[PDB]
Each structure stands twice: as C-alpha cells, then as structure tokens.
Design a protein around this ligand. Structure first.
Ligand SMILES: O=C(O)c1cnc(-c2ccccc2)s1
Ligand SMILES: [Zn+2]
Length: 140
C-alpha cells in the first residue's frame, strides 16, 4: 500500500483505490494502474519535473529504501500478477529489485521529488508507474 499527497490530490495504485477514492475520483487510467482522488487537507509531496533514471524506492516487504536505475516510462507487458494478469501497462519504469504485491504504493523519488509508485513485481524486477508527466498534479 501507499499514496502520494500533492496539493489537494491523492495518487494511488488504481487496483488498491478505495470506495472513498472512487467517490472523490479526479482521474484514472487502467493502462497506467493510476487513480487520482481529491483531498480536503493539503498534501506536502513534490512531483519531480525531470528525466532522472536513478532514484530510491521504499520496499515495505524489506522495510528498506533501495537505490535503483530504472528504464524510461514505456508500454511494457506486465505478466500474470494477482492484481493484473498478462496485460500491457503504459508509463511503466522497470528496475532490478524486490517487489511483492503488498509493495505497490511504495514511492520512487530522486533529488527533484516523487517520480512514481511501485505497481509491478516478480522475477527480480520492480515496476514503477511514472507520475512526472502529470503536470496538473502541481496546480488546480
Ligand atoms: O538521490 C538519489 O535518488 C540517488 C542517488 N544515487 C542513486 C543510485 C545509486 C546507485 C545506483 C543507482 C542509483 S539514487
Ligand atoms: Zn529527478
């Protein structure tokens, strides 16, 4: 689990979104595994505006932060996961690292702020849903 709180937005894995997320839906993209819901309390997170391909992500299954190199956001074929079986995911970034189902929502960050959140795992790979192209997250 885990979310990004920037301005009056909550960003979550679309597959872990709650009733309340859907009750306050701002924007969702099935292909990206992303859902943004409205919040009443102001969020303190900053979204990275950069093309960093190195950063640190939180892995709840190891209670550890790992430094990783990750691929540019791409259309990647996500294999048979419990959340998503053999299906395509866009704006997805892969690195070599540990990711279990419960690791989704762990934040990947650089010096410039939040890059994305854990979305995929398996085979010694961690996939991150990129949020840096969503410029609207730092306004209205
Ligand atoms: O400030 C940051 O987010 C980082 C600094 N150095 C990093 C790093 C180090 C080794 C391999 C891959 C990545 S990530
Ligand atoms: Zn950066």
């Amino acid at each position: 689990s885990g979310a990004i709180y920037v301005g009056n937005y909550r960003v979550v894995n679309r597959h872990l979104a709650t009733h309340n997320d859907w009750a306050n839906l701002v924007w969702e993209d099935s292909s990206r595994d992303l859902l943004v819901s409205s919040t009443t309390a102001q969020g303190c997170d900053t979204i990275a505006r950069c093309d960093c391909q190195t950063g640190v992500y939180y892995c709840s299954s190891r209670r550890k932060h790992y430094p990783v190199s990750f691929s540019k956001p791409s259309l990647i074929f996500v294999e048979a996961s419990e959340y998503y079986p053999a299906r395509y995911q866009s704006h997805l970034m892969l690195a070599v690292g540990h990711s279990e189902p419960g690791d989704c929502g762990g934040i990947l960050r650089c010096q410039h702020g939040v890059v994305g959140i854990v979305s995929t795992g398996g085979n010694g790979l961690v996939g991150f849903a990129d949020v840096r192209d969503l410029l609207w997250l730092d306004e209205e």
